[PDB]
Write a protein that binds this ligand. Structure first.
Ligand SMILES: CCCCCCCCCCCCCCCCCC(=O)OC[C@H](COP(=O)([O-])OCC(O)COP(=O)([O-])OC[C@@H](COC(=O)CCCCCCCCCCCCCCCCC)OC(=O)CCCCCCCCCCCCCCCCC)OC(=O)CCCCCCCCCCCCCCCCC
Ligand SMILES: CCCCCCCCCCCCCCCCCC(=O)OC[C@H](COP(=O)(O)OCCN)OC(=O)CCCCCCCCCCCCCCCCC
Ligand SMILES: CCCCCCCCCCCCCCCCCC(=O)OC[C@H](COP(=O)(O)OCCN)OC(=O)CCCCCCCCCCCCCCCCC
Ligand code: HEC
Ligand code: HEM
Ligand code: HEM
Ligand code: HEM
Ligand SMILES: COc1c(O)c(C)c(C/C=C(\C)CC/C=C(\C)CC/C=C(/C)CC/C=C(\C)CC/C=C(\C)CCC=C(C)C)c(O)c1OC
Ligand SMILES: COc1c(O)c(C)c(C/C=C(\C)CC/C=C(\C)CC/C=C(/C)CC/C=C(\C)CC/C=C(\C)CCC=C(C)C)c(O)c1OC
Lengths: 76, 369, 98, 41, 43, 240, 184, 64, 162, 54, 41
């Protein structure tokens, strides 16, 4: 419940009214840098598992095809 | 007013963390999807007949003669798919950010997940196509006290009208139990409040919900409706199977039998284990391993925001979950089988073994252990 | 080794949010007790550090790298308090066991 | 008095006596009841 | 797990054991009777 | 499986907002009526379905009254046949599927109402199958009542090749080449399997316009009500 | 425990008057009857078909071929009758003892009474007997009283010119769904 | 009088097509040479068909 | 105490007896109704060697097949003991040229597809169980061989299977 | 009940129908199964369509 | 600025402007949208 949530003291929190501030301050100004900042802190943890999923998927497909491909030596 | 006051306490003015990302939208989306499914399901129930002579005819009559009946039917099907998308992302949020330490909320969740999977299975049986019937027979025998139980559910020697009608009754009645279990899910959570992506105590920074996480939920509802209507109005059959548009032939078997895509991960596991029973058990564990998840947390940090090795293990887990989803689709032949066998071994070893050992190592790196 | 530890420290990224290791520790009864035992200065400071982190997270932003806590800068302030709580708990537990 | 001290005082035993009795009661009730119904019709 | 299963606790284990068995027994009788398990009922 | 995945064709309804060519649906209905109706059934498509689509009420009316339909035993237990009504469905070729088995050398010609929807890559498949009765290669031999259609599963479809160039004459006069006929019947069967294709795409266009209007506005309202916090500046001022 | 606290708060440690007579039992009976109806209704729904060709045949199949299906069907019908007996005595208790001064409870009650009457009406239409057919017709047309939409409403509910299969199926859906709203 | 056959005709000219066709010829004789072989040429032909048909369609409806 | 509790214990059994009875009928309701709980026709001439035929007997595919000299020869060659399910081909067939089986995969109940698989008998597209011509499970996860109904060779060209 | 079933079979069955009472119902004390089986096989009810199609 | 003071500041008027606008918006949207769909196909 709001109130009696926890003990917070000696802090000053300033804020502005919505209509008084620009809606999208520097949206693409810093948004792009930040989004890019973000992607470079998480890309090495996220991407290489999905890269090897793509390799395993392709491999499986091709391997399966080769498996299906008739054995020329057989039947001759 | 007492009730409004109760609502205010729970919805209008409920202290909530200020820094929760868009992933925390997803559970609310699930509730909306539930209502959407129920509403669409009710408008399918005014014309559907649960008779094996007339079920396919009633579905075609809905699609062809009822005004906008095709819209409500394909909204129901793609809303089930959207329900499972939001469910998987909700469970992934719970796994990544350490939200399973809310143990009662997590257990009510995995009960809800089991109920939703059973509801979707019987609902997919309901149109009585070729694919519905063959899939139905398979799962019931999966239960095979096995023989008796299977026959009980089937209501006869083999799935036939006896099943269809009781599956209509059960598919009708379970989403209301899901709604009640979701109310219990919300209660067991407000006692503790929601978690934040940093995993820290957010008591110093909490904001109201009405103006901050309501308009956010409204925006998420709008985006989910955009994806649902572009799934319905533009690609209405990219997720379904074409063979479900044929009538149910007990004499004709399809060349390849699948459940719908969200059951695939399980399907893969089942196929992987050589023993039938083993498969069934592993399959169950596949879902149940989650419940087991709050007892495997060996780290002093709740979330994975500051835990990179367990982040890598988590994304490898998401990776081979996608691999198991693909394998299920592939037919039985080399080398799909081996991948399936490994992928299942890797799935159970990452959840059971690798993550607590990694959490111990991460605690050792911060001079905590 | 510690070089990698510092790299891992950087990896943790709480420095990016200026979070002391103790700040990061997920709250636990023992932790809570230790927190209670913390002097006000630490408590108040801990609070602001935590609050700051959440706000940064809310905006999906990080502190200026220089503001970031250095591996060396990080302090285990609550560590000792926790040690005491744990030991006491261990003692009582053993007493119960016997 | 012995029964109370033996099968009705410990709740576990209370349950045991109940379950066991019920197991047999059905046999007796059905048998007795059927006799009556048959005699009636 | 000695915290809740120490030497002293074992004492309690044996102390409660009898009661535990009784409860299983009650459930056993029930299962047999309720489900009409006939393998056991027939004897 | 072991068959050529039918090559996609640049259909006039292939696009995201691209509707069906209704003259092609009319020509394909003529193709079905003159060729395909002898063996295949359309149980979920009544003559009324045609009305408003490539055919009017009266247009379909004459089309419906060209055929006869048993209208039950009346009140004298007298099964009797009457000219079809706009409410009548398309006539059965056979009274029961066992007659279809007897008349088609053991094979059952399936309902063509949802064939396009029921066949993987149906529109293509259909076109391919109807236009894919190529000669069996060496090493493969098919029994009577079978034909080597690479696309058909097993490449052994009981159906004999039904579209010979100039099989039927299009009333519109468009040259009745085998292909022009296969494309028309694939469009029609498609229409059959989804009579609402056109209406839907209109809805989808209105949905895209409404979401393009509503998503930035709801985003702007959210960013208004969240700007307050997103500008909040926190400062720690220990009394020191 | 936050789930056991509500159960304790409403059924165990709830302070109740010591002198309330047997009439105060009746509302609890109504709740039991509601469950009983729901349970019996669920076991009617596993064999009932809401098609005008097969509804009477499905009801006779329940009574004649389902094991103890006659028991569940007549329990459902006489439980609807028992529901209305307990409902009338509950309302009479509320009128006699001045319990209507609990105004919000009384208004939620009369909403529940309207919902129960609508549920029982559509349920009686459901077996598609001679009585059911005409009765439904009359009450739908009962709406016709409306000056402008009376006919339209009747048409809407009927789902056609006159009650026919269109009605039966939507009455099955509504009769299924309303007792859960009654429970809420 | 088939635009499709004409399309196929142009398709015939395609080099990729002849290559696949060549293989088919080898096997036909191959099968014939092997008096009792269940070595079919669906394997080979399918391949040929795919290319031929795929190209055919590329320039088949446009011609239609 | 024993007087008052005996009444509690007495009552319990009674309730317990009624509660099992009520719950029992309900449980029983979902069991097969009388209609379902409550004949066969085949023609030998219908099938020639190396072919299977089913008549959906009892709501399940009643596979009836004829076998070739070779077909019959290999199945006998199969190692009964080495079989997943020890049942020599002839053990399930009154006639070597004639084999009759029920089409429910021991595993999860799909229809095995005749004339497909790595054992020249059957294959179930559900989980990859390969049955030999004898209908014996040879590869895969299917637990037991396909069932052979107690048929009747009514005539050289007629059969009454069960 | 056995005598009344005989009365229905010999008199009342010429005009009146019993659509919800199969010969299954006959089986019982008043009419044993094979009594019933002979009673059911007295009649020659059309089974329906044939593989031929009729 | 006038609009705010006239139809967007008093909530009642806010609703009025919304409802009235919506009443006409449908006409315009449907018309405009249909034009587009037709042009497309
Ligand atoms: C990239 C180019 C633009 C750019 O730089 O944008 C910066 C901007 C990030 O700026 P920032 O200052 O670094 O972050 C603060 C956010 O802007 C603060 O906003 P936010 O991102 O927290 O907004 C809440 C969140 C809410 O998102 C949700 O609710 C999503 C719900 C889940 C998805 C839907 C469910 C189904 C999923 C199926 C799979 O919305 C979004 O993430 C984007 C909404 C876009 C709406 C349509 C705009 C046209 O990028 C985006 O917002 C990305 C999306 C738009 C591009
Ligand atoms: C999807 C990729 C999203 C992405 O960008 O990944 C990186 C992100 C990092 O999140 P975090 O480190 O908490 O940072 C938040 C603010 N800095 O990571 C995240 O967004 C956190 C991921 C939370 C939920 C991910 C769900 C993945 C799919 C789960 C499906 C299956 C899971 C279990 C199913 C059984
Ligand atoms: C040694 C690291 C060297 C890094 C050099 C890069 C430059 C670093 C300095 C500049 C900063 C660049 C940006 C930094 C972003 C955040 C930091 C980062 O990326 O750190 C490296 C990251 C974490 O390192 P850490 O977790 O300590 O490594 C243990 C490896 N297991 O570790 C990684 O990202 C490595 C991830 C490797 C994952 C390999 C997974 C292979 C197996 C996938 C199996 C998937 C399923 C396969 C199928 C199964 C079923 C058949
Ligand atoms: C008009 C030009 C058409 C079109 C578009 C199709 N047919 Fe027929 N058909 C016939 C029979 C006996 C069968 C079944 C054969 C078998 O199963 O072996 C079919 C089958 C089809 C299909 C289904 C293909 C599949 O994969 O199941 C399709 C899409 C199809 N046909 C298209 C018989 C006939 C006719 C009597 C000689 C004629 C005329 C047509 N078909 C005409 C057409
Ligand atoms: C109580 C509310 C619900 C009712 C009354 C209901 C009713 C129905 C009916 C009548 C059908 C058959 C019509 C059809 O073929 O689409 C159906 C299908 C289906 N339902 Fe539901 N349903 C409900 C909730 C749900 C929920 C919550 C889910 C998701 C788990 C779901 C998943 C499905 C699926 C997957 C189908 C098959 C759709 C298809 O034919 O492809 N339903 N439902
Ligand atoms: C039936 C579908 C479900 C619905 C409707 C649902 C509903 C909700 C809602 C409304 C919330 C609060 C808002 C939020 O935090 O997202 C929530 C949170 C939560 N749910 Fe669910 N949920 C569902 C499935 C699940 C499942 C399957 C699990 C278990 C894996 C689960 C576990 C949780 C947890 C742990 C939280 C807390 C989030 C946090 O504080 O981090 N839910 N759910
Ligand atoms: C959600 C729970 C319920 C379901 C699924 C349900 C379902 C059914 C079904 C399938 C029938 C037709 C079978 C028959 O002829 O008896 C029926 C009949 C009926 N139901 Fe319900 N019902 C439910 C709750 C109720 C309730 C609460 C009432 C009382 C207001 C009620 C009153 C009736 C009545 C009066 C009949 C007619 C019985 C007769 O044929 O004489 N039902 N119900
Ligand atoms: C802590 O903040 C909250 C919160 O207080 C509530 C009540 C709900 C529940 C609100 C809903 C709309 C539930 C979902 C919708 C249903 C129909 C169920 C939340 O989803 C939520 O966000 C994390
Ligand atoms: C003191 O006042 C109370 C009271 O507080 C409560 C909770 C109940 C509720 C007790 C019941 C037995 C009713 C249970 C609640 C229901 C909603 C019944 C319906 C439930 C179904 C599952 C059907 C009363 O009957 C009552 O009056 C004496």
């Amino acid at each position: 419940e709001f109130g009696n949530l926890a003990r917070i003291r000696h802090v000053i929190s300033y804020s502005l009214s919505p209509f008084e501030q620009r809606a999208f301050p520097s949206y693409f100004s810093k948004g792009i840098p930040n989004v890019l900042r973000r992607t470079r802190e998480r890309i090495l943890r996220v991407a290489p598992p999905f890269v090897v999923v793509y390799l395993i998927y392709t491999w499986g497909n091709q391997e399966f095809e080769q498996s299906k491909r008739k054995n020329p030596a057989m039947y001759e | 007013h007492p009730l409004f006051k109760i609502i205010n306490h729970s919805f209008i003015d409920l202290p909530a963390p200020s820094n929760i990302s868009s992933w925390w939208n997803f559970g609310s989306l699930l509730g909306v999807c539930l209502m959407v499914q129920i509403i669409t399901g009710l408008f399918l129930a005014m014309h559907y007949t649960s008779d094996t002579m007339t079920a396919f005819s009633s579905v075609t009559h809905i699609c062809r003669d009822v005004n906008y009946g095709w819209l409500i039917r394909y909204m129901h099907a793609n809303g089930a798919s959207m329900f499972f998308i939001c469910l998987f992302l909700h469970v992934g949020r719970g796994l990544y950010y350490g939200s399973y330490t809310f143990m009662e909320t997590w257990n009510i969740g995995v009960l809800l997940l089991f109920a939703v999977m059973a509801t979707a299975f019987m609902g997919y049986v309901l149109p009585w196509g070729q694919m519905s019937f063959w899939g139905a027979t398979v799962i019931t025998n999966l239960l095979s006290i096995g023989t008796t139980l299977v026959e009980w559910i089937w209501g006869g020697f083999s799935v036939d009208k006896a099943t269809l009608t009781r599956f209509f009754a059960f598919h009708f009645i379970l989403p209301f139990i899901i709604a009640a279990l979701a109310i219990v899910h919300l209660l067991f959570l407000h006692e503790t409040g929601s978690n934040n992506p940093t995993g820290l105590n957010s008591d110093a920074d909490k904001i109201p919900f009405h103006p901050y996480y309501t308009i956010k939920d409204i925006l998420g509802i709008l985006i989910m409706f955009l994806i649902l209507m572009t799934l319905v109005l533009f690609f209405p059959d990219m997720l379904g199977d074409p063979d479900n548009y044929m009538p149910a032939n007990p004499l004709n078997t399809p060349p390849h039998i699948k459940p719908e895509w969200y059951f695939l991960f399980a399907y893969a596991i089942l196929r992987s284990i050589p023993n039938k029973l083993g498969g069934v058990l592993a399959l169950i564990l596949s879902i149940l391993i989650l419940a087991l998840m709050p007892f495997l947390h060996t780290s002093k940090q709740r979330s994975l925001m500051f835990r990179p090795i367990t982040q890598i293990l988590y994304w490898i887990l998401v990776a081979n979950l996608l691999i198991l989803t693909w394998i299920g689709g592939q037919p039985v032949e080399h080398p799909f089988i081996i991948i399936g066998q490994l992928a299942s071994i890797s799935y159970f070893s990452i959840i059971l073994i690798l993550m607590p050992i990694s959490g111990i190592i991460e605690d050792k790196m911060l001079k905590l252990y | 080794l510690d070089g990698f530890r510092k790299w891992y420290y950087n990896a943790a990224g709480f420095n990016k949010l200026g979070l002391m290791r103790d700040d990061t520790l997920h709250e636990t009864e023992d932790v809570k007790e230790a927190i209670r035992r913390l002097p006000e200065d630490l408590y108040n400071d801990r609070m602001f550090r935590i609050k700051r982190a959440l706000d940064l997270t809310m905006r999906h932003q990080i502190l200026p790298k220089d503001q970031w806590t250095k591996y060396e800068e990080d302090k285990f302030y609550l560590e000792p308090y926790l040690k005491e709580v744990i030991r006491e708990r261990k003692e009582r537990e053993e007493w119960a066991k016997k | 008095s012995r029964l109370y001290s033996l099968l009705f005082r410990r709740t576990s035993t209370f349950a045991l006596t109940i379950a066991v009795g019920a197991l047999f009661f059905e046999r007796a009730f059905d048998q007795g009841a059927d006799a009556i119904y048959e005699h009636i019709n | 797990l000695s915290r809740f299963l120490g030497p002293r606790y074992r004492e309690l284990a044996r102390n409660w054991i009898p009661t535990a068995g009784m409860w299983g027994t009650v459930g056993a009788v029930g299962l047999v009777w309720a489900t009409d398990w006939r393998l056991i009922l027939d004897w | 499986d072991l068959e050529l995945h039918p090559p996609s064709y640049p259909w006039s309804h292939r696009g995201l907002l691209s509707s069906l060519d209704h003259t092609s649906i009319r020509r394909g209905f003529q193709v079905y009526k003159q060729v395909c109706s002898s063996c295949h059934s359309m149980d979920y498509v009544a003559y009324r379905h045609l009305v408003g689509v490539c055919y009017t009420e009266e247009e379909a009316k004459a089309l419906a009254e060209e055929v006869e339909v048993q209208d039950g035993p009346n009140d004298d237990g007298e099964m009797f046949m009457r000219p079809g009504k706009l409410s009548d469905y398309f006539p059965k070729p056979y009274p029961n599927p066992e007659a279809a088995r007897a008349a088609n050398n053991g094979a059952l010609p399936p309902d063509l109402s949802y064939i396009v929807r029921a066949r993987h890559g149906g529109e293509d498949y259909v076109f391919s199958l109807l236009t894919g009765y190529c000669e069996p290669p060496t090493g493969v031999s098919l029994r009577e009542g079978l034909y080597f259609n690479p696309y058909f599963p097993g490449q052994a479809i009981g159906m004999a090749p039904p579209i010979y160039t100039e099989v039927l004459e299009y009333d519109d006069g468009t040259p009745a080449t085998m292909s022009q006929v296969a494309k028309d019947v694939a469009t029609f069967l498609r229409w059959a399997s989804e009579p609402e294709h056109d209406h839907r795409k209109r809805m989808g266009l209105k949905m895209l316009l409404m979401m393009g209007l509503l998503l930035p506005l709801t985003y702007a309202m959210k960013r208004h009500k969240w700007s307050v916090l997103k500008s909040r500046k926190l400062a720690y001022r220990p009394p020191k | 425990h936050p789930l056991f606290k509500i159960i304790n708060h409403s059924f165990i440690d709830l302070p109740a008057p010591s002198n309330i007579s047997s009439w105060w039992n009746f509302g609890s009976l109504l709740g039991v009857c509601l469950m009983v109806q729901i349970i019996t209704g669920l076991f009617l729904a596993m064999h009932y078909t809401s098609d005008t060709m097969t509804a009477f045949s499905s009801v006779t199949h329940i009574c004649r071929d389902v094991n103890y299906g006659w028991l569940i069907r007549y329990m459902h019908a006489n439980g609807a009758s028992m529901f209305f007996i307990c409902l009338f005595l509950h309302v009479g208790r509320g009128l006699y003892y001045g319990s209507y001064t609990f105004m919000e409870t009384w208004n939620i009650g009369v909403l529940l009474l309207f919902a129960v009457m609508a549920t029982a009406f559509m349920g009686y239409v459901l077996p598609w007997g001679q009585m059911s057919f005409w009765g439904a017709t009359v009450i739908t047309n009962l709406l016709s009283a409306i000056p402008y939409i009376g006919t339209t409403l009747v048409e809407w509910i009927w789902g056609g010119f006159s009650v026919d299969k269109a009605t039966l199926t939507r009455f099955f859906a509504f009769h299924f769904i309303l007792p859960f709203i009654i429970a809420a | 009088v088939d635009p499709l056959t004409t399309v196929r005709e142009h398709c015939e000219q395609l080099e990729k097509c002849v290559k696949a066709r060549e293989r088919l010829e080898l096997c036909d004789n191959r099968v014939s040479s092997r008096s009792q072989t269940e070595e079919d040429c669906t394997e080979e032909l399918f391949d040929f068909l795919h290319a031929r048909d795929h190209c055919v369609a590329h320039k088949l409806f446009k011609n239609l | 105490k024993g007087f008052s509790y005996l009444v509690t214990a007495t009552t319990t059994v009674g309730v317990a007896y009624a509660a099992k009875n009520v719950v029992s009928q309900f449980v029983s309701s979902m069991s097969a109704s009388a209609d379902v709980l409550a004949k066969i026709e085949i023609k030998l001439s219908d099938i020639p060697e190396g072919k299977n035929m089913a008549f959906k007997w009892r709501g399940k595919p009643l596979f009836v097949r004829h076998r070739t000299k070779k077909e019959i020869d290999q199945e006998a060659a199969v190692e009964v003991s080495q079989l997943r399910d020890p049942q020599h081909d002839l053990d399930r067939v009154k006639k070597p040229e004639w084999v009759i089986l029920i089409g429910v995969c021991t595993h999860l109940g799909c229809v095995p597809i005749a004339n497909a698989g790595d054992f020249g008998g059957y294959y179930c597209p559900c989980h990859g169980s390969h049955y030999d011509a004898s209908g014996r499970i040879r590869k895969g996860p299917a637990p037991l061989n396909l069932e052979v109904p107690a048929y009747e060779f009514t005539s050289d060209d007629v059969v009454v299977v069960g």
